[PDB]
Tab-separated table of C-alpha atoms and ligand atoms in Angstrom:
chain	number	residue	atom	x	y	z
A	1	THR	CA	2.708	-12.502	-42.365
A	2	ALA	CA	0.898	-13.363	-39.410
A	3	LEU	CA	3.485	-15.721	-38.294
A	4	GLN	CA	6.211	-13.350	-37.530
A	5	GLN	CA	3.678	-11.288	-35.498
A	6	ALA	CA	3.252	-14.404	-33.274
A	7	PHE	CA	6.876	-15.094	-32.563
A	8	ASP	CA	7.338	-11.667	-31.710
A	9	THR	CA	4.236	-11.873	-29.263
A	10	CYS	CA	5.613	-15.106	-28.325
A	11	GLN	CA	9.025	-12.985	-27.801
A	12	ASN	CA	7.871	-10.669	-25.661
A	13	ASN	CA	5.572	-13.305	-23.559
A	14	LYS	CA	8.367	-14.927	-22.959
A	15	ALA	CA	10.245	-11.728	-21.319
A	16	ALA	CA	7.638	-10.335	-19.448
A	17	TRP	CA	7.300	-13.947	-17.537
A	18	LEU	CA	10.985	-14.135	-16.907
A	19	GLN	CA	10.327	-10.386	-15.732
A	20	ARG	CA	7.596	-11.545	-13.507
A	21	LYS	CA	9.372	-14.560	-12.531
A	22	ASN	CA	12.367	-12.533	-11.542
A	23	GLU	CA	10.942	-10.164	-9.550
A	24	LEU	CA	8.703	-12.414	-7.594
A	25	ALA	CA	12.048	-14.250	-6.562
A	26	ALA	CA	12.988	-10.963	-5.515
A	27	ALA	CA	9.705	-10.130	-3.406
A	28	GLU	CA	10.111	-13.313	-1.869
A	29	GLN	CA	13.668	-13.546	-0.838
A	30	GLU	CA	13.382	-9.973	0.772
A	31	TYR	CA	9.940	-11.206	2.435
A	32	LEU	CA	12.117	-14.082	3.651
A	33	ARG	CA	15.242	-12.165	4.819
A	34	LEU	CA	12.866	-9.654	6.761
A	35	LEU	CA	11.246	-12.443	8.726
A	36	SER	CA	14.614	-13.818	9.569
A	37	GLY	CA	15.410	-10.279	10.244
A	38	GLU	CA	15.217	-8.415	13.714
A	39	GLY	CA	12.578	-6.348	12.349
A	40	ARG	CA	8.892	-6.339	13.601
A	41	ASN	CA	6.758	-4.142	11.450
A	42	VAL	CA	3.908	-6.533	11.219
A	43	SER	CA	2.236	-3.804	8.590
A	44	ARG	CA	5.518	-4.297	6.589
A	45	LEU	CA	5.072	-8.416	6.872
A	46	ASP	CA	1.254	-8.127	5.964
A	47	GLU	CA	2.359	-5.500	2.839
A	48	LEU	CA	4.489	-8.276	1.812
A	49	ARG	CA	2.179	-11.089	2.021
A	50	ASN	CA	0.015	-8.757	-0.318
A	51	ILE	CA	2.978	-8.424	-3.051
A	52	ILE	CA	3.761	-12.134	-3.029
A	53	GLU	CA	0.005	-13.082	-3.785
A	54	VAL	CA	-0.439	-10.153	-6.699
A	55	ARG	CA	2.770	-11.012	-7.796
A	56	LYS	CA	1.700	-15.003	-7.660
A	57	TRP	CA	-1.197	-13.636	-9.450
A	58	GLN	CA	0.539	-11.772	-12.084
A	59	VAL	CA	3.032	-14.758	-12.615
A	60	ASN	CA	0.104	-16.981	-13.253
A	61	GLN	CA	-1.579	-14.806	-15.847
A	62	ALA	CA	1.360	-14.310	-17.708
A	63	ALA	CA	2.372	-17.996	-17.691
A	64	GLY	CA	-1.505	-18.166	-19.134
A	65	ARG	CA	-1.288	-15.791	-21.793
A	66	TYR	CA	2.123	-17.281	-22.775
A	67	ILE	CA	0.655	-20.836	-23.124
A	68	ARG	CA	-2.315	-19.140	-25.247
A	69	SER	CA	0.703	-17.757	-27.428
A	70	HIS	CA	2.234	-20.727	-28.179
A	71	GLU	CA	-0.459	-22.280	-28.849
A	72	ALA	CA	-1.409	-19.811	-31.410
A	73	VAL	CA	1.941	-19.496	-32.935
A	74	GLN	CA	2.045	-23.304	-33.362
A	75	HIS	CA	-1.845	-23.399	-34.511
A	76	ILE	CA	-0.471	-21.059	-37.080
A	77	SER	CA	2.820	-22.382	-38.093
A	78	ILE	CA	0.856	-26.089	-38.706
A	79	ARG	CA	-1.521	-24.219	-40.748
A	80	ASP	CA	0.844	-22.825	-42.819
A	81	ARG	CA	2.902	-26.123	-43.423
A	82	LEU	CA	-0.390	-27.905	-44.029
A	83	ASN	CA	-1.679	-25.327	-46.517
A	84	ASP	CA	1.224	-25.357	-48.814
A	85	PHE	CA	1.769	-29.338	-48.146
A	86	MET	CA	-1.775	-29.459	-49.794
A	87	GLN	CA	-0.849	-27.102	-52.416
A	88	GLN	CA	2.225	-29.288	-53.283
A	89	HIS	CA	0.535	-33.008	-52.911
A	90	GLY	CA	-3.042	-32.341	-52.703
A	91	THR	CA	-4.312	-34.146	-55.723
A	92	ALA	CA	-2.867	-37.284	-55.123
A	93	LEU	CA	-4.688	-36.896	-51.425
A	94	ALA	CA	-7.652	-36.012	-53.031
A	95	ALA	CA	-7.095	-39.547	-54.997
A	96	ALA	CA	-6.275	-41.335	-52.217
A	97	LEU	CA	-9.916	-40.517	-50.866
A	98	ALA	CA	-12.095	-40.273	-53.836
A	99	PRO	CA	-14.942	-43.233	-53.219
A	100	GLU	CA	-16.120	-40.571	-50.369
A	101	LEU	CA	-15.749	-37.109	-51.902
A	102	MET	CA	-17.218	-37.043	-55.559
A	103	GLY	CA	-19.720	-34.909	-56.116
A	104	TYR	CA	-19.558	-33.022	-52.712
A	105	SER	CA	-21.482	-29.800	-53.905
A	106	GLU	CA	-25.147	-31.374	-53.865
A	107	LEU	CA	-24.266	-33.213	-50.789
A	108	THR	CA	-26.619	-32.557	-47.976
A	109	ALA	CA	-25.223	-31.600	-44.536
A	110	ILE	CA	-25.577	-34.844	-43.131
A	111	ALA	CA	-23.688	-36.651	-46.084
A	112	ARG	CA	-21.025	-34.132	-46.114
A	113	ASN	CA	-20.441	-34.203	-42.477
A	114	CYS	CA	-20.250	-38.075	-42.751
A	115	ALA	CA	-17.972	-38.239	-45.716
A	116	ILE	CA	-15.593	-35.786	-43.672
A	117	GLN	CA	-15.985	-38.220	-40.813
A	118	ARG	CA	-14.873	-40.975	-42.937
A	119	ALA	CA	-12.393	-39.027	-44.683
A	120	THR	CA	-10.889	-38.252	-41.062
A	121	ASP	CA	-11.052	-41.693	-39.883
A	122	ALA	CA	-8.705	-42.664	-42.702
A	123	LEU	CA	-6.435	-40.188	-42.315
A	124	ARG	CA	-6.173	-41.364	-38.714
A	125	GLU	CA	-5.398	-44.852	-39.328
A	126	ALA	CA	-3.007	-44.239	-42.013
A	127	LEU	CA	-1.206	-41.889	-39.216
A	128	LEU	CA	-1.591	-44.579	-36.701
A	129	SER	CA	-0.455	-46.506	-39.257
A	130	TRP	CA	3.058	-44.542	-39.627
A	131	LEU	CA	3.143	-44.021	-36.238
A	132	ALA	CA	3.508	-47.590	-35.436
A	133	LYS	CA	6.731	-48.077	-36.995
A	134	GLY	CA	7.993	-45.052	-35.290
A	135	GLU	CA	10.162	-43.415	-37.912
A	136	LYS	CA	11.932	-40.231	-36.968
A	137	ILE	CA	11.829	-37.089	-38.309
A	138	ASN	CA	12.745	-33.337	-37.706
A	139	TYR	CA	11.067	-30.131	-38.225
A	140	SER	CA	10.025	-28.331	-41.429
A	141	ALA	CA	12.629	-27.500	-43.345
A	142	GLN	CA	10.862	-23.791	-43.981
A	143	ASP	CA	10.468	-22.770	-40.427
A	144	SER	CA	12.453	-25.303	-38.383
A	145	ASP	CA	14.295	-22.248	-36.866
A	146	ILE	CA	11.179	-20.840	-35.143
A	147	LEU	CA	9.889	-24.221	-34.459
A	148	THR	CA	13.530	-24.543	-32.675
A	149	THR	CA	13.364	-21.409	-31.111
A	150	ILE	CA	9.994	-21.889	-29.640
A	151	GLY	CA	10.285	-25.335	-28.391
A	152	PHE	CA	8.437	-28.733	-29.446
A	153	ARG	CA	6.529	-27.696	-25.618
A	154	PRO	CA	6.685	-25.010	-23.074
A	155	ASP	CA	8.667	-25.411	-19.987
A	156	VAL	CA	7.072	-27.166	-16.571
A	157	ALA	CA	7.753	-24.169	-15.369
A	158	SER	CA	5.314	-21.984	-17.051
A	159	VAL	CA	2.591	-24.912	-16.964
A	160	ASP	CA	3.321	-25.693	-12.790
A	161	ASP	CA	2.619	-22.198	-11.845
A	162	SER	CA	-0.405	-22.147	-14.044
A	163	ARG	CA	-2.321	-25.474	-12.740
A	164	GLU	CA	-4.462	-23.058	-10.113
A	165	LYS	CA	-7.556	-21.557	-11.913
A	166	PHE	CA	-9.055	-18.074	-10.141
A	167	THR	CA	-12.740	-17.469	-10.056
A	168	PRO	CA	-13.894	-14.325	-11.858
A	169	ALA	CA	-14.098	-12.457	-9.162
A	170	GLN	CA	-10.895	-13.452	-7.779
A	171	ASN	CA	-9.202	-11.856	-11.108
A	172	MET	CA	-11.323	-8.839	-10.995
A	173	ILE	CA	-10.319	-7.951	-7.349
A	174	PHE	CA	-6.199	-9.298	-8.312
A	175	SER	CA	-6.716	-6.707	-11.311
A	176	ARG	CA	-7.839	-3.798	-9.040
A	177	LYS	CA	-4.854	-4.103	-6.193
A	178	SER	CA	-2.108	-4.726	-9.402
A	179	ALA	CA	-3.889	-1.480	-10.586
A	180	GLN	CA	-3.661	0.088	-7.012
A	181	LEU	CA	0.200	-0.989	-7.045
A	182	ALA	CA	0.871	0.417	-10.010
A	183	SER	CA	-0.907	4.032	-9.605
A	184	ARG	CA	0.875	3.800	-6.459
A	185	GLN	CA	4.714	2.844	-7.304
A	186	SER	CA	4.163	5.424	-10.206
A	187	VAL	CA	4.593	7.870	-7.600
B	1	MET	CA	14.376	26.771	29.962
B	2	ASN	CA	11.758	25.815	27.590
B	3	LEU	CA	8.085	24.958	28.169
B	4	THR	CA	8.058	21.130	26.865
B	5	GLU	CA	9.528	20.138	30.606
B	6	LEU	CA	7.790	22.537	32.238
B	7	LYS	CA	4.314	21.520	30.999
B	8	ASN	CA	4.971	17.855	31.652
B	9	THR	CA	5.793	17.446	35.480
B	10	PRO	CA	3.962	16.951	38.282
B	11	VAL	CA	3.962	20.246	40.691
B	12	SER	CA	5.886	19.398	43.826
B	13	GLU	CA	9.185	19.649	41.977
B	14	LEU	CA	8.232	22.243	39.705
B	15	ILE	CA	7.115	24.279	43.309
B	16	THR	CA	10.308	23.037	44.694
B	17	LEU	CA	12.491	24.378	42.289
B	18	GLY	CA	10.584	27.915	41.732
B	19	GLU	CA	11.435	28.526	45.735
B	20	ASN	CA	14.454	27.148	45.612
B	21	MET	CA	15.175	29.615	42.651
B	22	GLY	CA	12.303	32.070	44.431
B	23	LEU	CA	9.188	34.073	43.303
B	24	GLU	CA	6.789	34.304	46.048
B	25	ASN	CA	4.653	32.791	48.024
B	26	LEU	CA	3.931	30.274	45.124
B	27	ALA	CA	2.092	27.287	46.650
B	28	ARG	CA	-1.728	29.086	46.371
B	29	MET	CA	-2.248	29.809	42.928
B	30	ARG	CA	-2.715	27.313	39.278
B	31	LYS	CA	-0.389	25.586	37.919
B	32	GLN	CA	-0.582	27.927	34.671
B	33	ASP	CA	0.093	30.715	37.247
B	34	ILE	CA	3.526	29.293	38.910
B	35	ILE	CA	4.363	28.314	35.113
B	36	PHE	CA	3.779	32.266	34.075
B	37	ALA	CA	5.707	33.513	37.235
B	38	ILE	CA	8.519	31.461	36.522
B	39	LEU	CA	9.300	32.325	32.902
B	40	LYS	CA	8.670	36.013	33.658
B	41	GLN	CA	11.558	36.061	36.436
B	42	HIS	CA	13.724	33.736	34.016
B	43	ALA	CA	13.248	36.522	31.211
B	44	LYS	CA	13.880	39.076	33.583
B	45	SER	CA	16.822	37.223	34.686
B	46	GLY	CA	17.961	37.669	31.052
B	47	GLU	CA	18.134	33.799	29.561
B	48	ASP	CA	16.365	33.457	26.145
B	49	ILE	CA	13.813	30.890	26.513
B	50	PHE	CA	12.305	28.381	23.846
B	51	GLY	CA	8.672	27.930	23.609
B	52	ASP	CA	6.460	25.258	21.410
B	53	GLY	CA	2.634	23.988	20.939
B	54	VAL	CA	-0.284	24.483	18.656
B	55	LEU	CA	-1.163	27.653	16.971
B	56	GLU	CA	-4.942	28.626	16.511
B	57	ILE	CA	-6.379	32.419	15.346
B	58	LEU	CA	-9.377	33.910	15.814
B	59	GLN	CA	-11.917	35.735	13.826
B	60	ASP	CA	-9.608	38.617	13.693
B	61	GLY	CA	-6.361	37.142	13.722
B	62	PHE	CA	-5.487	37.408	17.468
B	63	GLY	CA	-3.690	34.162	17.147
B	64	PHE	CA	-3.104	32.107	20.497
B	65	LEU	CA	-0.814	28.887	21.093
B	66	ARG	CA	-2.092	26.210	23.465
B	67	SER	CA	-0.290	22.840	24.566
B	68	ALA	CA	-1.652	19.699	24.001
B	69	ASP	CA	-0.263	18.508	27.882
B	70	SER	CA	-2.894	21.305	29.118
B	71	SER	CA	-5.754	19.874	27.215
B	72	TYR	CA	-5.635	23.365	25.190
B	73	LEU	CA	-6.529	25.156	28.421
B	74	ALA	CA	-7.025	28.976	27.730
B	75	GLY	CA	-3.970	29.983	30.874
B	76	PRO	CA	-2.025	32.461	31.018
B	77	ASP	CA	0.955	30.354	29.428
B	78	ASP	CA	-0.767	30.619	25.837
B	79	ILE	CA	1.683	31.955	23.301
B	80	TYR	CA	0.132	35.584	21.657
B	81	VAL	CA	1.147	35.817	17.882
B	82	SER	CA	0.592	38.875	15.850
B	83	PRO	CA	-1.360	38.729	12.576
B	84	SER	CA	2.251	39.969	11.116
B	85	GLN	CA	3.859	36.789	11.214
B	86	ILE	CA	0.865	34.545	10.220
B	87	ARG	CA	0.432	36.422	7.096
B	88	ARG	CA	4.142	36.844	6.773
B	89	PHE	CA	4.612	32.477	7.038
B	90	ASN	CA	0.993	31.642	5.551
B	91	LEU	CA	0.110	29.414	8.536
B	92	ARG	CA	-2.913	28.434	9.955
B	93	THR	CA	-4.918	26.997	12.390
B	94	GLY	CA	-3.823	23.130	13.572
B	95	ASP	CA	-0.034	24.446	12.288
B	96	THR	CA	2.681	23.008	15.124
B	97	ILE	CA	4.910	25.569	15.890
B	98	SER	CA	8.376	26.002	17.862
B	99	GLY	CA	10.620	28.969	18.406
B	100	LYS	CA	11.884	31.931	19.875
B	101	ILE	CA	9.196	33.562	22.632
B	102	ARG	CA	9.605	36.925	23.027
B	103	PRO	CA	8.894	37.845	27.463
B	104	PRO	CA	5.569	40.200	27.324
B	105	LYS	CA	6.043	43.739	27.689
B	106	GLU	CA	3.609	46.791	29.656
B	107	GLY	CA	0.287	46.733	27.869
B	108	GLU	CA	0.141	43.231	27.604
B	109	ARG	CA	0.033	40.008	29.225
B	110	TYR	CA	0.577	37.267	27.274
B	111	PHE	CA	3.685	35.898	26.116
B	112	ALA	CA	4.958	36.696	22.373
B	113	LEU	CA	7.143	35.096	20.142
B	114	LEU	CA	10.412	36.568	18.902
B	115	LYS	CA	10.934	34.037	15.772
B	116	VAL	CA	10.286	30.534	15.020
B	117	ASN	CA	12.234	27.540	13.853
B	118	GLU	CA	10.214	25.135	12.750
B	119	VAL	CA	6.705	24.564	12.016
B	120	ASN	CA	4.709	21.545	12.601
B	121	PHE	CA	8.451	19.309	12.395
B	122	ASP	CA	9.401	20.904	9.330
B	123	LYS	CA	11.234	24.290	8.054
B	124	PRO	CA	9.173	27.268	8.465
B	125	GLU	CA	9.652	27.890	4.473
B	126	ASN	CA	9.409	24.273	3.327
B	127	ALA	CA	6.037	23.698	4.806
B	128	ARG	CA	4.540	26.325	3.281
B	129	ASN	CA	4.617	24.629	0.104
B	130	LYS	CA	1.804	22.174	1.197
B	131	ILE	CA	-1.947	22.258	-0.028
B	132	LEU	CA	-5.026	21.929	2.043
B	133	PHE	CA	-6.496	18.596	3.421
B	134	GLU	CA	-9.600	18.703	1.193
B	135	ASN	CA	-7.402	19.149	-2.039
B	136	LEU	CA	-6.448	15.465	-1.814
B	137	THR	CA	-8.363	12.658	-3.488
B	138	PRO	CA	-9.405	9.854	-0.989
B	139	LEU	CA	-8.686	6.556	-1.425
B	140	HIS	CA	-9.770	2.970	0.189
B	141	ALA	CA	-7.966	2.006	3.149
B	142	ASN	CA	-5.109	-0.358	0.939
B	143	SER	CA	-2.797	-1.001	4.038
B	144	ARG	CA	-3.504	-3.058	6.766
B	145	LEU	CA	-3.432	-2.487	10.482
B	146	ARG	CA	-2.864	-5.641	12.772
B	147	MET	CA	-3.730	-5.743	16.393
B	148	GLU	CA	-1.670	-8.658	16.854
B	149	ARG	CA	1.452	-7.867	19.083
B	150	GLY	CA	2.877	-11.395	18.364
B	151	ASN	CA	3.819	-11.781	22.160
B	152	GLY	CA	0.522	-14.132	22.964
B	153	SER	CA	-0.591	-11.316	25.712
B	154	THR	CA	-3.172	-13.017	28.099
B	155	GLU	CA	-5.185	-9.560	28.239
B	156	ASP	CA	-4.670	-9.583	23.615
B	157	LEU	CA	-7.898	-11.818	23.362
B	158	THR	CA	-10.165	-8.961	22.748
B	159	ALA	CA	-7.636	-7.482	20.097
B	160	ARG	CA	-7.243	-10.891	18.105
B	161	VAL	CA	-10.803	-11.294	17.462
B	162	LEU	CA	-11.267	-7.802	16.452
B	163	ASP	CA	-8.590	-8.929	13.443
B	164	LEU	CA	-11.010	-11.843	13.017
B	165	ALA	CA	-14.000	-9.246	12.882
B	166	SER	CA	-13.356	-6.203	11.450
B	167	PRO	CA	-9.816	-5.523	9.694
B	168	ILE	CA	-8.312	-2.172	10.509
B	169	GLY	CA	-6.703	-0.174	7.715
B	170	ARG	CA	-5.133	3.355	7.463
B	171	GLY	CA	-7.827	5.999	6.001
B	172	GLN	CA	-10.847	4.664	7.097
B	173	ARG	CA	-13.854	5.361	8.699
B	174	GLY	CA	-14.572	3.610	12.007
B	175	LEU	CA	-17.679	3.889	14.441
B	176	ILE	CA	-18.361	1.411	17.640
B	177	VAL	CA	-21.830	0.825	18.679
B	178	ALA	CA	-21.974	0.215	22.440
B	179	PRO	CA	-24.471	0.425	25.368
B	180	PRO	CA	-23.432	1.431	28.647
B	181	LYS	CA	-21.065	-1.111	30.597
B	182	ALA	CA	-20.445	-2.860	27.639
B	183	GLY	CA	-16.321	-2.378	28.075
B	184	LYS	CA	-15.646	-0.294	25.303
B	185	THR	CA	-12.975	2.271	27.039
B	186	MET	CA	-10.656	-0.292	27.931
B	187	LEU	CA	-11.015	-1.892	24.257
B	188	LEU	CA	-10.566	1.545	22.983
B	189	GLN	CA	-7.153	1.556	25.303
B	190	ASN	CA	-5.950	-1.670	24.374
B	191	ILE	CA	-6.345	-1.003	20.566
B	192	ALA	CA	-4.410	2.532	21.216
B	193	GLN	CA	-1.596	0.954	22.980
B	194	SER	CA	-1.979	-1.854	20.212
B	195	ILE	CA	-1.156	0.913	17.770
B	196	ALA	CA	1.200	2.211	19.304
B	197	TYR	CA	3.135	-1.297	19.990
B	198	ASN	CA	2.792	-2.374	16.370
B	199	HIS	CA	3.019	0.493	14.610
B	200	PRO	CA	5.682	3.148	16.204
B	201	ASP	CA	5.779	5.206	12.984
B	202	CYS	CA	2.136	6.201	12.718
B	203	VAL	CA	0.766	9.104	14.888
B	204	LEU	CA	-1.642	8.480	17.619
B	205	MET	CA	-3.740	10.814	19.049
B	206	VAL	CA	-6.826	9.820	21.615
B	207	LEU	CA	-9.730	12.446	22.343
B	208	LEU	CA	-11.703	12.208	24.965
B	209	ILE	CA	-14.795	14.397	25.890
B	210	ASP	CA	-16.942	15.121	28.981
C	1	ATP	N1	-12.615	-9.055	29.911
C	1	ATP	C1	-12.537	-8.547	31.041
C	1	ATP	N2	-12.521	-9.242	31.880
C	1	ATP	C2	-12.778	-8.552	32.993
C	1	ATP	N3	-13.954	-7.757	33.240
C	1	ATP	C3	-14.205	-7.180	32.390
C	1	ATP	C4	-13.729	-7.919	31.187
C	1	ATP	N4	-14.050	-6.654	30.034
C	1	ATP	C5	-15.031	-5.882	30.224
C	1	ATP	N5	-15.181	-5.830	31.883
C	1	ATP	C6	-15.422	-5.284	32.851
C	1	ATP	O1	-16.462	-4.430	32.237
C	1	ATP	C7	-16.820	-3.105	32.792
C	1	ATP	C8	-16.844	-2.115	32.012
C	1	ATP	O2	-16.449	-0.841	32.349
C	1	ATP	P1	-15.915	0.282	31.207
C	1	ATP	O3	-15.511	1.511	32.029
C	1	ATP	O4	-14.643	-0.427	30.448
C	1	ATP	O5	-17.175	0.556	30.348
C	1	ATP	P2	-17.483	1.215	29.014
C	1	ATP	O6	-18.389	0.089	28.079
C	1	ATP	O7	-16.291	1.553	28.408
C	1	ATP	O8	-18.486	1.988	29.373
C	1	ATP	P3	-18.606	3.537	30.754
C	1	ATP	O9	-17.534	3.479	31.243
C	1	ATP	O10	-19.300	4.368	30.169
C	1	ATP	O11	-19.216	2.541	31.934
C	1	ATP	C9	-15.286	-2.928	33.316
C	1	ATP	O12	-15.654	-2.136	34.829
C	1	ATP	C10	-14.400	-4.155	33.780
C	1	ATP	O13	-14.551	-4.908	35.029
C	2	MG	MG1	-16.369	3.637	29.506
């Protein structure tokens, strides 16, 4: 039943990502209006720059964990669909690859690996032959709603900000600064 | 009048106004003595006078109140504070005080305190409910102080490179290692004026010894 857990994890990740996005937008717009304003508090400008950078780091991390959750839920859904599909029509699939599946129990490691590789090549050629004709399909009937509500792929706004990678020291110092921000804003 | 305006004035107009009101041959004595005589005459006239300053307590509660402008000189103008109000208001050394001041009577030569209207720029009852400095938890310098004024001053360079060499933050421990004839005094006053310009909110104090 981990599909529902993955779904709600993706939902709350999206909610947190939207919260980070809107708070970053508010911070940047107030920083811009203070820049255009008559105020000249340089300390305020520096602290606003610090807020902007820490919020950008938080948004990047939220996008990264959202991408991880989305790929995890997609993998779980694919695994479940393939599992029930093979439980439905797996005997015919095994018969279609019989010339390299007989007596798999006593085969050695290299023989088992080579047989698996040959089976993967066979199914890959079948899949490319199927995709050559371009026969359009839809989502799985049992879990169509989850796939539709999570989307085929995450939007660009969740990857365009996630294309920058931080060094581990940068991650640690940003985490410390975020903890300091939380401690100072709680009071 | 009040001690605040009296202290921060050159002795010229002070002695002229003292002569115009008329005290004595008020030329050959200390400035503190002149202020003391003027305050005594004004108190004898009958007008109430405010007072303000910084309070200190001796080992026996014999409290004094000095002024920052006079470099905390132990002159006669310092306000006497008895232990009674010290215990009543639960104040200690370093608490800025301001309020009515009692003129001295026979038996003492120091101005006393009638009542205090505020303590350390706060109400006397509100400032009592405060913890000591050592009871706080130290933290790193989160905020950043920038010496760049932004006006492109030709002499601002000494400050600018400082931001490129040693960032300044609130609540940090700063030390300067300087040999004689290194221009450290001008650098320090430049830092002080840059702080006063960029950050007028923060209280600035500059201490000089010998
Ligand atoms: N940028 C500068 N341009 C011109 N003169 C400078 C500059 N920086 C420093 N000086 C000179 O350096 C001299 C050093 O005198 P200053 O009083 O500033 O020294 P200090 O290092 O503060 O120490 P001390 O006063 O004890 O000698 C000044 O008299 C000043 O003429
Ligand atoms: Mg000097």
